[PDB]
């Protein structure tokens, strides 16, 4: 799967401070990939954390322990 150029574009324009701000086609397409990598990194770090705890599935506890760093690496 993956995000769509249109969706990602609506998520960015949702937060821009200057209504004159635009996004190039390549930039938007690059973001689609970046957002995908972000989601996988979180999901994968979650697995790591849970495995380091000998847990069987990723719950919100393991996801919490990887949050701060995940936000700092971005």
């Amino acid at each position: 799967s993956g995000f769509r150029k249109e969706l990602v574009s609506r998520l960015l324009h949702l937060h821009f401070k200057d209504d004159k701000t635009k996004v190039s086609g390549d930039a938007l397409q690059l973001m689609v990939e970046l957002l995908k990598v972000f989601v996988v990194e979180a999901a994968v770090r979650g697995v790591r954390q849970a495995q380091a705890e000998d847990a069987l599935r990723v719950d919100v506890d393991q996801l919490e322990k990887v949050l701060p760093q995940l936000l700092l690496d971005f």
Partner: protein, 103 residues
């Protein structure tokens, strides 16, 4: 004002829902790969995380652009989002050169 808020809320939820649907799919693949499931609450958290993270990306891109005098966000501001990790930047730059060609 009471309709402008309800409108802003609906639209937000529309976007949240799309992110959430997509996040669920991406996590589905990670589950198959690493062979381990995610609680429904973990997926929902990752979704909200991704949603709010888009705000950070957006406001940064806009400022990185204005920093280079531009009003249009291009491919090199996106790269500035991935500076923290060399491997990350390398991966995004690898995908960037790829997009450029065909695009």
């Amino acid at each position: 004002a009471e309709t402008e808020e309800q409108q802003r809320f609906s639209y937000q939820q529309r976007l949240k829902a799309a992110v959430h649907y997509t996040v669920g799919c991406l996590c589905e693949e990670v589950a198959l790969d690493k062979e381990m499931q995610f609680s429904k609450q973990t997926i929902a958290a990752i979704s909200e995380l991704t949603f709010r993270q888009c705000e950070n990306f957006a406001k940064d891109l806009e400022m990185f652009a204005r920093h280079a005098k531009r009003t249009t966000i291009n491919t090199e501001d996106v790269k500035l989002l991935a500076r923290r990790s060399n491997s990350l930047l390398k991966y995004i730059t690898d995908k960037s050169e790829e997009i450029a060609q065909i695009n």
